[PDB]
Amino acid sequence: MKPARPCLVCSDEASGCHYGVLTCGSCKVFFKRAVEGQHNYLCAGRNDCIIDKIRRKNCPACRYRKCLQAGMNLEARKTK
Amino acid sequence: MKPARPCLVCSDEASGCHYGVLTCGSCKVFFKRAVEGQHNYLCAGRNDCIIDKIRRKNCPACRYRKCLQAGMNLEARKTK
DNA sequence: CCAGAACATCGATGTTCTG
DNA sequence: CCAGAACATCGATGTTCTG
Ligand SMILES: [Zn+2]
Ligand SMILES: [Zn+2]
Ligand SMILES: [Zn+2]
Ligand SMILES: [Zn+2]
């Protein structure tokens, strides 16, 4: 049992730099899926929901904001 | 005077009087499924999300709770 | 009419592979 | 090493059916 190396968006076990920030493998494909298309989702609360290995599923909206705020960007850990 | 036409739990068009309250196809099933099944429903906000035709999938814990506040009951009968 | 079973669909996640 | 396709298995959800 590992000392956590925590994903900057959800606190679950990071897996490497993904799109510019340490993150587990789910935020990587979440973000990739988010940016490419229609992220018009709505918060059921007050635009500030907690996140954590269970609750990242609850609010897509907040999760997308947490990706942005932590610096994820597509042509990063890449090109120019 | 009373709203008859829409779901008491998510404001989607009701399908008849299920387990005690005017409701839709979904909250009916959801309700039974809540009570009987063992789950993990965890609010990510403050235990007061807006449950509606689209944010209802976001917090099932709050859907459940809205269902008990509104009157749904399992041993509750039939017949118009 | 309604409860409840069936059926079908949503989508997150995890793996392994290439370049 | 990361990006990003493929393809899998699930849990949660939701609609239409049949008694
Ligand atoms: Zn994460
Ligand atoms: Zn939120
Ligand atoms: Zn409903
Ligand atoms: Zn909630």
Side-chain angles (χ1 to χ4, degrees):
Chain A
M1 229 228 151
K2 263 200 250 20
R5 107 192 238 219
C7 161
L8 278 213
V9 164
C10 64
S11 277
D12 194 29
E13 244 301 343
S15 80
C17 258
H18 300 120
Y19 304 107
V21 174
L22 215 91
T23 80
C24 61
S26 41
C27 303
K28 174 193 182 312
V29 63
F30 166 84
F31 184 77
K32 176 47 170 156
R33 218 169 197 136
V35 283
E36 304 254 65
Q38 287 172 115
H39 38 277
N40 324 327
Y41 339 95
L42 276 199
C43 195
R46 259 147 242 169
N47 288 136
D48 55 344
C49 300
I50 317 318
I51 196 153
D52 75 23
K53 184 209 171 176
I54 7 216
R55 333 210 262 249
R56 38 214 210 194
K57 313 151 337 171
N58 306 192
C59 198
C62 281
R63 203 182 182 181
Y64 192 51
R65 294 199 174 90
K66 271 284 262 272
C67 281
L68 244 43
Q69 221 182 54
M72 304 196 56
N73 46 347
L74 273 194
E75 291 223 293
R77 255 61 130 181
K78 257 181 331 308
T79 45
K80 278 270 282 160
Chain B
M1 256 54 167
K2 82 193 186 317
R5 188 43 92 264
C7 191
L8 254 63
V9 173
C10 84
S11 304
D12 185 26
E13 269 201 60
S15 57
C17 167
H18 311 294
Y19 306 94
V21 334
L22 171 55
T23 274
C24 69
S26 352
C27 319
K28 171 203 157 346
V29 227
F30 170 93
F31 182 72
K32 183 154 166 56
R33 232 157 206 171
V35 283
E36 314 230 297
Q38 265 87 130
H39 291 97
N40 243 202
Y41 276 179
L42 231 306
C43 197
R46 331 191 149 54
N47 272 327
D48 81 13
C49 331
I50 312 171
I51 290 319
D52 67 36
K53 182 223 238 87
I54 72 191
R55 301 195 263 266
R56 73 183 177 199
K57 254 163 158 140
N58 285 178
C59 193
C62 271
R63 200 200 194 175
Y64 190 45
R65 219 256 255 122
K66 174 159 185 211
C67 282
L68 302 187
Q69 90 185 252
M72 310 192 67
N73 214 338
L74 225 54
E75 268 214 66
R77 263 68 83 135
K78 313 208 175 38
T79 297
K80 47 120 142 271

